[PDB]
Amino acid sequence: GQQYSSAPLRTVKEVQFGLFSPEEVRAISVAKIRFPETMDETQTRAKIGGLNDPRLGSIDRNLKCQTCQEGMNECPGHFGHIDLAKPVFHVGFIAKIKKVCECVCMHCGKLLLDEHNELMRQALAIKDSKKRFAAIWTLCKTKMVCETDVPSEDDPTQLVSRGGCGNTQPTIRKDGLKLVGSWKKDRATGDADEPELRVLSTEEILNIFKHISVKDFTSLGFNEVFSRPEWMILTCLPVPPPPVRPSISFNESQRGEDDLTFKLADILKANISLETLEHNGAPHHAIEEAESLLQFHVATYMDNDIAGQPQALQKSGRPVKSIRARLKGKEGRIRGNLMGKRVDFSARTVISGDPNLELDQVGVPKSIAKTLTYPEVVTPYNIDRLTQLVRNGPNEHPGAKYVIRDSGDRIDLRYSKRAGDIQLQYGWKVERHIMDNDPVLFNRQPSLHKMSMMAHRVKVIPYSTFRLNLSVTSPYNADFDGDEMNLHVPQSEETRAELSQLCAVPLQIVSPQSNKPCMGIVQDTLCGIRKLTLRDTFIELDQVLNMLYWVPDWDGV
């Protein structure tokens, strides 16, 4: 349970995407993040004021967080930072960077085309941020010279001077994490033949991006507040707190650090090397070497499954789990932890049909009812019932498992010394067993239907199978060759109503899929119904009487 916070509770109305300015990373950061070593204060097992908690989140479970005083199941993580010795490309933005270079002057930071080209003012007109950038690029890519004077908005005889700089633009190509250009030149009207080939540095691209005007970058996909192009190049790297990269700390003394933690220390180590090379006697090539290694780790940390093949492998042969990898579809954050979730108040067992159950009920094995719970609020209407269910305990059928006090702290009837002399108060919740007639969600996966999930009445019964009415077989697409089914128990009066009022089996009879019923009479009943209704078929009094008494709402006539 989380504690009371005086902060006003709200809902998220908008998600404003963007990029971190290095300045922000440094601002939000609670520590920097100097040593690759996790902890062990010279082997003295306690977190090192350098990597995981130089003020960040928490380990130990016991022992609170050093920044917020909260501790473990309250403390969200706290971000840190690593100041990189040299600028590095963000793997993700590597091609957007390439494309921005392709649109801008690699010397003055001005759009290669403007309001002076007709097709350009046409493309600039585009309202769509992505589509506009799309068009600007296809135009600007081929413009290989930053223009000084372009023909006037009337005649070609007089040329109007736009922005300055008459420099020739490189023909940029990717060389796996590196951007290498090829300027044609001029040399006696010809040349190329044989152009100048050199790699464009992260810092030079950074400086061109830094010089791209607000008006200009805003014409491209960018936003002067949330995403300036200069932010696609990493300077100050945010360090995610332990909650993101938890150590699977087996036994008492055995580390068990996360994959992200190691990959970080790799970056850390790769950074310290670089910084000392440039501070000390810089052997010039030794730097463009250690730089390319830091660029590698900062790239592979975010996305490991890069085109220019060499996958960063953990010492085991097994490759490193990237952050990109964490989020990627079905199994993994979005699709696996958010769109779908493992849930509590769920049960699953083998199904078997029953002709004695009602269409809308479901047979619930006692053991399952004795586990599954509803948190009922102590009200004057139910005070006496609930007091008996509590008296009954977690072991007897109509019983309860827990009593929740005003205080918020859970009473375990299984163990509490005061489990007998428990004395209920209005406003407490009693976590009672699942009882006959409670509404529950019954499901049979796949679940290609509204109908694959229907709300049923409970029916606590003996034996380990979920029991269902035979006519309800079809919507679920169930048979009893060994099919299992899922049951979900709502915890609120609000959700209970949703189920009973919208999802209930009877409501589901006539289906909108084909404007006709999705449940009918089947198997034995369909077979015997023909057999019963032939002209040849007559029934003697003795049996007629039983046939009659069997109809539960028979008029007695």
């Binding site: 998600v15 995407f17 993700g92 995403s227 579809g329 084909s514």
Partner: protein
């Protein structure tokens, strides 16, 4: 418009050939969705998932990370109108039960 007409005719035939009957409206809606854009928008990551809907909603099918990186680069704003975003946000979606609001009227409460 004739594109829609054919698109339905064709979709309907796949269903009808198998013996199966699906009420008009269902096929109509799909057919219409593909069409309303001006052309034939595919039920792929290249079609519908490339529309101007919320970043989080779109990221929940096929291009996840790539979509989210672009959201950062363009400083996209999720409206938070879609189902998928509210699901991600652990909020009550503006779906059936949540398609309207409930308030207490002090006036009628003082009347009863």
């Amino acid at each position: 418009e004739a594109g829609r007409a054919a698109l339905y005719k064709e979709v309907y035939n796949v269903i009808a050939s198998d013996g199966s009957y699906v009420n008009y409206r269902h096929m109509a809606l799909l057919v219409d969705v593909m069409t309303t854009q001006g052309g034939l928008t595919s039920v792929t990551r290249h079609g519908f998932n490339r529309s101007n809907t919320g970043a989080l909603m779109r990221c929940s099918f096929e291009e996840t990370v790539e979509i989210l990186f672009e959201a950062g680069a363009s400083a996209e704003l999720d409206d938070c109108r879609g189902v998928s975003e509210n699901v991600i946000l652990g909020q009550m979606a503006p779906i059936g039960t949540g398609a309207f609001d409930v308030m207490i009227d002090e006036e009628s409460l003082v009347k009863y």
